Structures are given as C-alpha cells and as structure tokens.
Ligand binder design. Structure first.
Ligand SMILES: *C(=O)/C=C/c1ccc(O)cc1
Length: 125
C-alpha cells in the first residue's frame, strides 16, 4: 500500500510520480480527468466504492456517461470554473447514487502538477 493521506497539500506532487500500479495502492478513490472530463486514470479503490470496472470506464466521459449525478452546479460546475481559472482545489461532500446504493462521500478536486489534467479524489464518510 502507498502512504499518501487523503487531502494532503502536496498530493499532486506525490501522484505525479506514480504509474498505474501505484495508483491502485492508494487508500482512497483516485480519478484523473482531462479538461473535457474524459477519464484518463481510475484506480481500484474507486471501483471498490462504486462497482465500476476501471478498465471499462477509462476513456469515457465522467460527466456525460459515467456519473450523471455529478452533472450539477455543485460538482461539474466547480470543475469547469477550476479548469477555466487555472486554480482548482476544493473539498465537499456529495452523494453518489447512479446505478448504485446511494453512497455518501467526501470529494477533493485538485489540478494536476502539470496543470493540464485534474484529479478527483473520493473517500467514504
Ligand atoms: C452519480 O452519477 C455518480 C456516479 C459515479 C461517481 C464516481 C464513480 O467512480 C462512478 C460513478
């Protein structure tokens, strides 16, 4: 297992150094998106939470296809403001309820170190 804590202030530095294998060792869900919301990476802990197979969701659009319950001002809207402003770093609670038992989570969205992709981090609450 990888020793990085959910919500660490340098989290994007640590994850920049990891391959696909190491992402699967995190204690929390990790999804990497491009500026359009297409899924670039999706780790095993996130599938454990949502029941999605990471190999099937990679390449799909998070907001249009995989997670329509996040297509809302409070989730997708904050993502789009962050992409546009170049500053994305926010934490909030949310409920995932599309094709799954309604599940309360804490979400941390943050821009990647290179500034051209974006992380969504998820843990149960
Ligand atoms: C509501 O539609 C949320 C869906 C969702 C969140 C996170 C995932 O990894 C997969 C689906």
């Amino acid at each position: 297992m990888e020793h990085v804590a959910f919500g660490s202030e340098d989290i994007e530095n640590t994850l920049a150094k990891m391959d696909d294998g190491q992402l699967d060792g995190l204690a929390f869900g990790a999804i990497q998106l491009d500026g359009d919301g297409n899924i670039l990476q999706y780790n095993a802990a996130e599938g454990d939470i949502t029941g999605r197979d990471p190999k099937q969701v990679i390449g799909k659009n998070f907001f249009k296809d995989v997670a329509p319950c996040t297509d809302s001002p409070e989730f997708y809207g904050k993502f789009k403001e962050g992409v546009a402003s170049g500053n994305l770093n926010t934490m909030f609670e949310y409920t995932f309820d599309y094709q799954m038992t309604p599940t309360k989570v804490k979400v941390h969205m943050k821009k990647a170190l290179s500034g051209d992709s974006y992380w969504v981090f998820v843990k149960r609450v």
